[PDB]
Design a protein around this ligand. Sequence first.
Ligand SMILES: OC[C@H]1O[C@@H](O)[C@H](O)[C@@H](O)[C@@H]1O
Length: 439
Amino acid sequence: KFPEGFLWGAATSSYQIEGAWNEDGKGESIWDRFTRIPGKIKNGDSGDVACDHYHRYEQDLDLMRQLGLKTYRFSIAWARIQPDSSRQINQRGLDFYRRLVEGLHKRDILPMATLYHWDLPQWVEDEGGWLSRESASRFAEYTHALVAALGDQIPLWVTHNEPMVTVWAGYHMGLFAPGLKDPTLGGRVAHHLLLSHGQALQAFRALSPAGSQMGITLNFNTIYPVSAEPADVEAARRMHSFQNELFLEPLIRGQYNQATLMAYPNLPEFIAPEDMQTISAPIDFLGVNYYNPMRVKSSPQPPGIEVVQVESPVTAMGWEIAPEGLYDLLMGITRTYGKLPIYITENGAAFDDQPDQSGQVNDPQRVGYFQGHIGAARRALADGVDLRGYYAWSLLDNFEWAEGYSKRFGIIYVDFETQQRTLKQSAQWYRDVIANNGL
Ligand SMILES: OC[C@H]1O[C@@H](O)[C@H](O)[C@@H](O)[C@@H]1O
């Protein structure tokens, strides 16, 4: 059994579920724009409608209640709040989150809100987006507004979701909005993401909302060398420092690591005198997102590291299923950076789900994923990790970014033609886990 009061949840993000993309005075986000670009998204899909959750949120709140969720992690669409460069608050957008949060509490579900889950308002992008240091101040102003409005109604706040993905997918690879493909920008962007977190945290501390805490969510891929050879070991260590500690090192220690400074030699040009102190001010908790490990070998070619693909066992995303990677990640963070409070803010899997003739959605592979991963999380808790909660990604099948609707991560099936929701077997199973407070 997990600890009494352990927070079992499920997670979503705003662009992935809400729809209502141009309703109620919501401004365009960089993802509204990105999804109009032909060729960027599988099937030419977008989040224009998604799960239609902006309209259907009460149905989704009842589904959360049906499962017995203790907590629900969502993100806030910044462009619903500040549609445009006037910076004026859009009250209808704010009201939606107020109604959502009130509905959570009415059902005894603790809200966890992510301020930034990738859907930057286009107006912030027009002012430089994360290339501009001033975006950190815009993000702090957005945070201040939301925490002034809802701070003591939302007990757990996360600033950023997965800043490494914003850097890599958004600026290195152009896979995600805003679609830049210039690896030399990644340090600058990383710094400004971190600075925005620090300034948002400052805003949060100044407001000091009763009973509320703020952290940040980072993704990680536990790294294993492909062999015991020294060069593979060295490549794996360098890849871990970059892949897994690019953000944690400055957040906890107030410095960038060497792998990061090597990757982005101009990074120190963006660091003003008090930025590292601001970035490293204490967080209340760390959000951990984990799906899969990465297997590394050395290479002779720059940068001397190769990630090796794994054919099996994998999910529909081709991501290796290795629950021991979750245990090892948690133990490593805890050993390296100390026993701070951790929430697993995402863990889950995509499989090709299909209703049967009777309308049931039986997803045993997803059950098996959760069984392994929740079990690994329990072992990490038994071995001294301060794990406070676990959020299944996702409550709902949703818009999976550049994969569009080709990937289903929900524990609840969504027919996107009719918006019908059906609990999958995994949701039924998870309800039982919550009720038992463990496996
Ligand atoms: O890809 C599955 C999930 O990966 C996570 O990196 C993101 O935070 C989610 O938005 C995404 O749906």
